[PDB]
Design a protein around this ligand. Structure first.
Ligand code: ANP
Ligand code: ANP
Ligand code: MG
Lengths: 266, 271
């Protein structure tokens, strides 16, 4: 049944003489939001590879992770150590995103999306998948991966998966475990404020900047420390232009020291 | 037997049924130097793809049929000749393979953006052709090191086969740009390799003043009419800076006769 491959060589040996492969890269500490990716992967290929890797370029629960994936019919858990993927100290050749890497979440995480684009390219060249699933909660990550896939001619179908949420709307994330009881009760307001922006856009709203500030002002007045609220073009995160019909609203804000992100496509 | 394929989709469809593939990326205008790579590729796989592709906006800062004709005799199965829009549909390349500081040394110092563009278009071609084996000429020694580097760092499962420089009778490294040389310039061109060899001979004889050998070669080419970009002694393969006791060395040079920039190198193995 399920197999745990730790080397590039063993992964490739398994993958040759296998048909269609759907691939889900993760960093472990798996939760229900990740399984939405795995379940969608299994609906697009019989053989699903889930990688678990923590990337020094961008909380180990290995046994509990693999049991959850086993019950979802995953074929291979690829969990290499750091030296397997980075045999030298440095990563000399990096996949360099455009200026997007310094916007939104990238502004306070320099080097982060470069590290995501590089490790995902490495994983792509290791697993050689036909389909790869990524969650929409990390929308900017998704744009970067779609972009590198196109620009580097990776023959891989990128499948966005919808954000799994709690009953009150909060996007599922391992970050949510940091919230105190008080902050967790307040955390659903992020998605509430994004939805009301999407409704204003649905009801013919034209002032992008006005809507972003209002949501930001509501969060700040309720105790949040807002990093950004931004309306951008869906999928690509290109600048929103007046008259665009495929939009997305994104925000990042801190309750205490925990930074939460969410988004709504309008 | 030989096919000319222009689209990525047709290349992928052909490649899918085929087993092992050896790959030779070129900018066309093919000469015997190129055919050396093609012969090496043909020794290692039944199916050899040669790509012909230029994009002067991204890297690089004879007709196709005439090129295809030279390859048809050599057992090439596919000439892959996409146009600019096929590989760069938005013109802009948003995601680039970024080399380390190496990209700004040696030829990189005189060719801003060039090795980033080479690294990127080679990765793209690797992802289109999906070869088992790719051949590159040692004449472009820094380029070869850049391609070995990205192949390892990005985990491309591709064997990188270097191929020795094919030369004219008088030693001049074969190159498409040699056609642009005046009669007088062409007769002067073999001095570059000659001086590189005399540097290698000083090294094989225990010479330790690397800086002085570099300067003498550059001053001599300068005195002979050339405009020298550089002459440098480096560690072989990695192109790291050479140190006093080093045994595996390469001497590299780039220099211009009038309008034409020429490069060459000589490897040295010291006992
Ligand atoms: N609630 C969610 N719904 C859908 N996809 C999700 C969700 N949370 C994460 N994902 C996706 O699953 C992958 C998560 O990788 P990983 O960073 O290991 O999880 P994470 O929850 O985002 N870590 P954290 O920074 O603590 O939130 C990415 O493709 C995410 O887009
Ligand atoms: N004389 C040569 N001997 C061996 N390999 C060579 C030689 N010249 C070129 N190659 C290799 O052939 C491949 C295609 O190189 P390409 O840039 O298309 O040729 P080129 O002659 O250097 N073009 P140009 O710089 O315009 O004159 C590369 O891997 C080169 O390193
Ligand atoms: Mg050429």
């Amino acid at each position: 049944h399920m197999q745990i491959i730790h080397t590039i060589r063993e992964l490739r040996t398994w993958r040759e003489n296998t048909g269609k492969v759907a691939f889900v890269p993760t960093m472990g500490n798996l939760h229900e939001g990740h399984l939405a990716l795995v379940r969608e992967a299994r609906k697009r290929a019989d053989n699903v590879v889930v990688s678990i890797f923590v990337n020094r370029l961008q909380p180990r629960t290995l046994q509990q992770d693999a049991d959850k994936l086993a019950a979802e019919g995953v074929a291979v858990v690829f969990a290499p150590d750091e030296k397997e993927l980075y045999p030298n100290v440095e990563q000399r050749y990096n996949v360099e995103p455009p200026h997007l890497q310094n916007e939104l979440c990238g502004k306070f995480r320099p080097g982060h999306f470069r590290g995501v684009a590089t490790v995902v390219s490495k994983l792509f060249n290791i697993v050689l998948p036909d389909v790869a699933c990524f969650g929409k909660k990390d929308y900017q990550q998704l744009a970067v991966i779609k972009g590198l896939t196109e620009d580097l001619n990776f023959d891989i179908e990128i499948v966005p998966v919808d954000t799994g949420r709690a009953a009150d709307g909060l996007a599922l994330s391992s970050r949510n475990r940091y919230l105190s009881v008080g902050e967790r009760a307040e955390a659903p307001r992020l998605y509430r404020e994004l939805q009301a922006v999407a409704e204003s856009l649905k009801q013919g709203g034209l002032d992008y900047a006005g809507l972003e500030r209002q949501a930001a002002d509501h969060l700040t007045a309720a105790g949040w420390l807002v990093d950004y609220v931004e309306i951008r073009r869906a999928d690509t995160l290109e600048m929103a232009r007046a008259g665009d019909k495929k939009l997305v609203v994104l925000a990042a804000a801190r309750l205490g020291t925990t930074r939460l992100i969410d988004n709504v496509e309008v």
